[PDB]
Amino acid sequence: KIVNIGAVLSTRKHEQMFREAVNQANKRHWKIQLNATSVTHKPNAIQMALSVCEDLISSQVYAILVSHPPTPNDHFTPTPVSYTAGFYRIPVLGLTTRMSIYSDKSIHLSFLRTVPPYSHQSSVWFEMMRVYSWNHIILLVSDDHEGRAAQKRLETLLEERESKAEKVLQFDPGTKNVTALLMEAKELEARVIILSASEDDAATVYRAAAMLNMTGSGYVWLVGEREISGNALRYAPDGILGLQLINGKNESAHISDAVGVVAQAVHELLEKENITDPPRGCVGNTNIWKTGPLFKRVLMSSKYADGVTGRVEFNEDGDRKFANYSIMNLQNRKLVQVGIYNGTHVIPNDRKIIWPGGETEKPRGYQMSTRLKIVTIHQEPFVYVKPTLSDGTCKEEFTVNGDPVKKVICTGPNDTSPGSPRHTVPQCCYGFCIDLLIKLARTMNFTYEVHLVADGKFGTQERVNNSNKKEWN
Amino acid sequence: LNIAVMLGHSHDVTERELRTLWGPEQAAGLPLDVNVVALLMNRTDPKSLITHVCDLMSGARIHGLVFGDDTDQEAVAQMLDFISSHTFVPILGIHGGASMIMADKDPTSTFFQFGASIQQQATVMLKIMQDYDWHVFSLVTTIFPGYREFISFVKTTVDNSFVGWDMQNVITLDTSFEDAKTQVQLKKIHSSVILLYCSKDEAVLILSEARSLGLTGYDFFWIVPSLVSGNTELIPKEFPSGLISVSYDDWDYSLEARVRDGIGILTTAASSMLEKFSYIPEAKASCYGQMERPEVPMHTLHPFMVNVTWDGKDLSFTEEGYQVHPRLVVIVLNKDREWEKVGKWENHTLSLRHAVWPRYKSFSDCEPDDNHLSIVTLEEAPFVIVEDIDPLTETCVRNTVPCRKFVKINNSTNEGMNVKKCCKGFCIDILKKLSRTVKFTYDLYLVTNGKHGKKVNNVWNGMIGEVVY
Amino acid sequence: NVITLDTSFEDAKTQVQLKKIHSSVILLYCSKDEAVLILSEARSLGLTGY
Amino acid sequence: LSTMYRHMEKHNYESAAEAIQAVRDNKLHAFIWDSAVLEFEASQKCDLVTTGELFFRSGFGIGMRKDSPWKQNVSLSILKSHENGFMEDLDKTWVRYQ
Amino acid sequence: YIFATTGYGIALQKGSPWKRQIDLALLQFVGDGEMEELETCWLTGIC
Ligand SMILES: *[C@@H]1O[C@H](CO)[C@@H](O)[C@H](O)[C@H]1NC(C)=O
Ligand SMILES: *[C@@H]1O[C@H](CO)[C@@H](O)[C@H](O)[C@H]1NC(C)=O
Ligand SMILES: *[C@@H]1O[C@H](CO)[C@@H](O)[C@H](O)[C@H]1NC(C)=O
């Protein structure tokens, strides 16, 4: 009859409020069936895991509620407690876990969360774009499991809107001089910047962007939660549109919501038959719960309409569904609430949006540099290619009608032979396509960089250097 | 230095210790002292495992642990993440958690399993299709995790492929226990090969449903990965015969041989470490004290797993610990409900098969299909000329039917080697045109006994002689 | 090629018989209740397309 | 036409400029390329004659990219050049030299 | 003599996603010889 619920918490106030919450859940539903047992966090790594596993397995605990950080900021993720509880496939609900390590269901079997992960930041970009009416996205994401998951989710949700990402750049952790990626981003016509990395990576990017012309005007900086805290606030230029989650910080509220969720599950556990007694002795039992997947099915099929946050729904990942989003604009290094999203509805605040640029109008992510580089194959009847004069220009000839023969400066290799140094020397090329290019320039503003073919062939499918590859030549 | 080996309940510990010691005795003489501490225990509890590994690292300073356990629990591999990320000790395994590897995390861990890589299995799954000459596919997946990566990988490898695979539109099943939308999703099948990415129970349920839905015919093909198969001793009655599966089985390679290979790999890694340095780093002295930040300044063997070779076999590990040259034993479910080895994928990442096509018999005791009409051809260069195949990782160039010709080894032995050869002819075009009208398949069967046929004492030879009997 | 259904209340052989349809026009010769039942089954079987 | 590759894969060249020289010094007995190029070469140099009939008649084009927004602005320019006599003037200034 | 060629083809309404499906098929038909064999069916003349 007695069911034990465990938690790894530091402060005694959290234990007291958990006891009050479970007592209220028993009052709100007959007989007493819930017992409270909590343990304290330790600075160790393996010793604390052994202690909590010994105190937990020998106590017949069904539900686990552990906050992700034991301190305001540390790397002590609650991986060991979940892994110890996974021996018998014990359902675990995360209080403030947000790293994507727990997101995948392949490794984690019965370890869910009570708060949405960072993956929802990828989905909210679509909500931002459908309001700002943009079509170009440039991604600045570090190399980690969270980054890979965000990239995969964004690609899956973007491939259905007939839009494709222009360029994807990778941030190697620990790097300091990454100005090459910023230069590549500058050399792109689109000026929409999306960043999702750690605090150190964000600071490193901002240090370069301070000197570089990446925040002057015509740029938008949409970043995640991790860049609205720490040194990011004091080293972030104004106009950055941040993201935050409402009611996602109160540990007491999270514990109350978790207790409310588990209250229905405790009562629904006895509804189904074929229930087995919880294991008491840690040593001497290596069995598997028959109702393991049944608990997950019941939790997924359950619906909740009460709580501090509000309606709670579980998706296939096991986290909250249709979470509330808030836009935290950065104006004079001060957080300003602008946009509120419930998943489908848009509720913008009456305060005007202050862009990082001087103008308050919405920037356009379409900056055509008009530097259309054109490469023309060396064809005798179509383009006359001759060496240029040593004075610096090319001689001008005339046709039978006496009209001048217009020509453009062309740059290409001279030797054009394998195993030879193909020095880039400008040449004098003209022909049928030169007149068409001149007409195009007259009709619309065009600038031409007349390149030449690298090898000398149009190029077809190439299958070399491995078992299977296809690269155009 | 000292490497401890932990195994489940097995033969007496003395024999296992002798087998482990026989490693350095045979070859690879090294001045480093190799000491092995073998332990046997039924229990596999997490706290017990932590205490045992702490005792092993405290006593004699064990620098390597390999856990070959017969337990079917999938969390055995995950239980050692703390040990790998804190004690900086290489981690190996044979069975149990190491049998199937799917955990990807930070590179601070020292996990290096001998199991088949989850992404690498698709390469063999497509190469067997290429060898069997079926370019049409039906990619059927589920909401189970670890399959979106499969979809991305197969899309990437068919977009970059120059063979010309007829990638039919995929059907992504949502969940089981529907009975109303599954038929709607599966009614669009029109190919002959269907994949399945689910669990064991889900696969059994979907095959049972397809039995009533008529999708278990003698013409369809089913490819199943190693996840559903798993152990090769339980054969549910819902699995039709002729199923094609690929896994990492130990039919030929023994646990002792795998332990010897792992010990050799570890010794080679230690020898390579001793080249650029001069001392072997040691882990923490005590399991209960934390007097320093657990950093990694000793330059551990994490990047040194690439240039490790043992017994003349290239046994390397990628950045994720995946084996570069796994085994990938192919198992086919026979009509007697057993798994038989067909293909091996050990030599130069190349696989060969015994070429046993007919495996469809006695499924529902009905529809005795006989559409596999054998076609006999005669070598007639003006009309039907055959030749070799240029090496381009392909079998058919554009539309040629695969010609399987029996080739004799020499003038003494008598074995018909099954070698595919490219063949073009007017009769081939006639057969191709007739196929679109008769709507049936025709597998060519070239012959070499005789040319036309005579009457030598009322005996028929040649193509006529072969077709008479 | 014609498909001759034997009887209703099968739920095991009706799908096998009806899986061979590849045309756009399908006839039906049954009673009122049998026609209602077969159309209800085809609703789940996806044979009631536009 | 698979028999063509029995000789194409061992006698093909890399440049039309050197191919013209090879076919002029009796190295090549035949050459396959665009009709316009061969007609221009025959008009300019007086040691080659075309023969046969046009096969695989396909026109030229302007290569672009799927995300390039310069589709209509180029198509309209091409139509203007075609229907305003610009193409005719270019042909008259680049065809029928003799 | 031909002036202002501007050869015609199959039209399609604005915003129709079938253009990418029909242009490839038409190009394949033109390049594979369907036009050449069907030319004698209708384009008959005395020269
Ligand atoms: C709850 O469990 C703990 C540990 O088993 C036990 O000490 C305590 O007495 C239990 N609570 C009650 C009210 O019995
Ligand atoms: C970064 O590297 C580039 C060239 O690789 C160099 O020009 C630049 O000065 C470097 N910046 C710093 C801060 O090292
Ligand atoms: C880039 O910023 C520097 C100041 O950091 C400025 O001097 C320079 O003119 C800017 N370049 C452009 C192209 O605006």
Ligand SMILES: *[C@@H]1O[C@H](CO)[C@@H](O)[C@H](O)[C@H]1NC(C)=O
């Ligand atoms: C406590 O949680 C509630 C959500 O129910 C939230 O509105 C409130 O701001 C939180 N209080 C503090 C001090 O964080």
Ligand SMILES: *[C@@H]1O[C@H](CO)[C@@H](O)[C@H](O)[C@H]1NC(C)=O
């Ligand atoms: C080309 O540039 C000039 C000056 O920069 C401008 O006046 C003109 O409008 C431009 N052409 C077009 C088509 O916008």
Ligand SMILES: *[C@@H]1O[C@H](CO)[C@@H](O)[C@H](O)[C@H]1NC(C)=O
């Ligand atoms: C040409 O200019 C831009 C660039 O393509 C394009 O948006 C515009 O619509 C074009 N002009 C007209 C008149 O269509």
